[PDB]
Scaffold this active site. Structure first.
Site, PDB file in Angstrom:
ATOM      1  N   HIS A   2     -15.236  -1.627  11.056  1.00 13.25           N
ATOM      2  CA  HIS A   2     -13.970  -1.853  10.315  1.00 13.25           C
ATOM      3  C   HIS A   2     -12.924  -2.936  11.274  1.00 13.25           C
ATOM      4  O   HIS A   2     -12.611  -3.948  10.674  1.00 13.25           O
ATOM      5  CB  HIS A   2     -12.831  -0.749  10.204  1.00 13.25           C
ATOM      6  N   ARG A  16       0.978  -1.121  -0.126  1.00 15.64           N
ATOM      7  CA  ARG A  16      -0.021  -0.049  -0.019  1.00 15.64           C
ATOM      8  C   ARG A  16       0.771   1.063   0.094  1.00 15.64           C
ATOM      9  O   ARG A  16       0.327   2.295  -0.174  1.00 15.64           O
ATOM     10  CB  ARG A  16      -0.989  -0.070   1.074  1.00 15.64           C
ATOM     11  N   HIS A  20     -12.157  -7.073  10.184  1.00 13.33           N
ATOM     12  CA  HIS A  20     -11.104  -7.665  10.278  1.00 13.33           C
ATOM     13  C   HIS A  20     -10.989  -9.075  11.444  1.00 13.33           C
ATOM     14  O   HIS A  20     -10.251  -9.756  11.269  1.00 13.33           O
ATOM     15  CB  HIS A  20      -9.891  -6.792  10.478  1.00 13.33           C
ATOM     16  N   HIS A  77     -11.772   0.376   3.721  1.00 11.62           N
ATOM     17  CA  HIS A  77     -11.434  -1.045   3.913  1.00 11.62           C
ATOM     18  C   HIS A  77     -11.256  -1.628   2.550  1.00 11.62           C
ATOM     19  O   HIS A  77     -12.021  -1.299   1.299  1.00 11.62           O
ATOM     20  CB  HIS A  77     -12.435  -1.789   4.548  1.00 11.62           C
ATOM     21  N   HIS A  78     -10.181  -2.587   2.162  1.00 13.36           N
ATOM     22  CA  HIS A  78      -9.982  -3.136   1.131  1.00 13.36           C
ATOM     23  C   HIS A  78     -10.804  -4.791   1.174  1.00 13.36           C
ATOM     24  O   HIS A  78     -10.395  -5.337   2.255  1.00 13.36           O
ATOM     25  CB  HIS A  78      -8.473  -3.448   0.848  1.00 13.36           C
TER      26      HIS A  78
END
Ligand SMILES: [Zn+2]
Lengths: 131, 87
Positions: free
Chosen positions: A124, A2, A128, A99-100
């Site tokens: 978020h 990233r 995860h 968020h990916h």
């Protein structure tokens, strides 16, 4: 990862006047198609750079800017994420996050706007951890 | 500026100055200073919605420093809490 440069790609999705109302549920809100149109094929130094440009574009789209308060529009104009409502905060994380869907650690596109969504901090962290 | 420890130490004008300082930090590159100012705002106003008064104002009032101060004053008075310094 990233932190490496890249070009934004993707089409985004149409959104109504309640774009972020579901940012705290499931995978959050999609990148708006109009915003995708403005960022497509542009190159960025990092995901953080894409993030800043993303919020700046939101502040320039009349249909989206109207969905945020004056104080939130000022934040977006300089590339900072809007503050979430108090109830959607998580500790020091008090601003909407990106968020990916498919992690970079597995062919997940860092700059693929169709693999990116807007979520509240609280949602978020849950995403995860398997919630 | 000077962060006072209670709403009662603030006149309405001084509280508007704190709100404009927060508007200035909204546009700073980071939120480090902004967030200390917001914690201060939340601590002294004591409104359950905290920062929502600034970032998510109700449609029934103005989204402006004057509108934030007015809502605060009405909520504090309705809950029998001390208001802004009358001087
Ligand atoms: Zn994520």
């Amino acid at each position: 990862k990233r932190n490496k440069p890249g070009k934004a790609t993707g089409k985004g999705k149409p959104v109504n006047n309640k774009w972020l109302n579901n940012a705290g549920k499931d995978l959050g809100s999609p990148v708006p198609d109009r915003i995708a149109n403005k960022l497509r094929d542009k190159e960025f130094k990092s995901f953080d750079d894409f993030r800043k440009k993303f919020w700046e574009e939101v502040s320039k789209d009349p249909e989206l800017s109207k969905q945020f308060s004056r104080n939130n529009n000022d934040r977006m104009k300089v590339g900072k994420a809007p503050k979430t409502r108090t109830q959607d905060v998580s500790g020091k994380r008090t601003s909407f996050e990106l968020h990916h869907e498919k992690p970079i650690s597995q062919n997940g596109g860092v700059y693929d706007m169709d693999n990116i969504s807007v979520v509240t901090p609280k949602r978020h962290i849950d995403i995860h951890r398997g919630k | 500026m000077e962060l006072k420890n209670s709403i009662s130490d603030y006149t309405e004008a001084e509280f508007v100055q704190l709100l404009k300082e927060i508007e200035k930090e909204n546009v700073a590159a980071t939120d480090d200073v902004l967030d200390v100012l917001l914690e201060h705002f939340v601590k002294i106003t004591e409104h359950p919605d905290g920062t929502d008064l600034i970032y998510y104002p109700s449609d029934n009032r103005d989204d402006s420093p004057e509108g934030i101060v007015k809502e605060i004053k009405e909520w504090r008075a309705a809950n029998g809490k001390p208001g802004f310094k009358q001087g």
